[PDB]
Amino acid sequence: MIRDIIRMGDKRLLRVAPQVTNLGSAELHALVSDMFETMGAAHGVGLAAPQIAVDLQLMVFGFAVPLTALANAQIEPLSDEMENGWEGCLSIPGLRAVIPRYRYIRYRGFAPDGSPIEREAEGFHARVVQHEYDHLVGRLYPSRIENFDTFGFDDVL
Numbered sequence: 001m002i003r004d005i006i007r008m009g010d011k012r013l014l015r016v017a018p019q020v021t022n023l024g025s026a027e028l029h030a031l032v033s034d035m036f037e038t039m040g041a042a043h044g045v046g047l048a049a050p051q052i053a054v055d056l057q058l059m060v061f062g063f064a065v066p067l068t069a070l071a072n073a074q075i076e077p078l079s080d081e082m083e084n085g086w087e088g089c090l091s092i093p094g095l096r097a098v099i100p101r102y103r104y105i106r107y108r109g110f111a112p113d114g115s116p117i118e119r120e121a122e123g124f125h126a127r128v129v130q131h132e133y134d135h136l137v138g139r140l141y142p143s144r145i146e147n148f149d150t151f152g153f154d155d156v157l
């Protein structure tokens, strides 16, 4: 079931999401399935649950980046090195900006079946995760733009 992605301006993208407590359940497996499908129909590499108006610590992502579904995520930077790179947002369609993120992270959480997940990530993999994590804490990419020359429409830049 493809879901409606909500757009910037909606208060539901501004909340801080509660934890998932139904790992292994059929309801959650259904929601994850929906999320991968919705992510695919919109052509994303990442999608957080608040983007489809579900208030939960849950994200999907993957392109190389492993196709992953991740609940109750925590992220730890592994150095102070930041890197710049392009981002967009299915909730801000048409736009893109350059955004500084940590080059090296570790993330931890659970697969939908209850299995623990813990990985080190770098570059693009690491960026997609930082970006979706931001959704879980009510934060969007414009608030991290440093150089506003880079903010523009995809077809123009």
Ligand SMILES: O=C(NO)N[C@@H](Cc1ccccc1)C(=O)O
Pocket: 043, 044, 045, 046, 047, 048, 051, 086, 087, 088, 089, 090, 091, 127, 128, 131, 132, 135
């Ligand atoms: O809406 C989302 N993520 O929340 N979508 C982004 C994910 C992303 C993150 C960082 C760099 C590029 C892309 C997208 O256009 O696929």
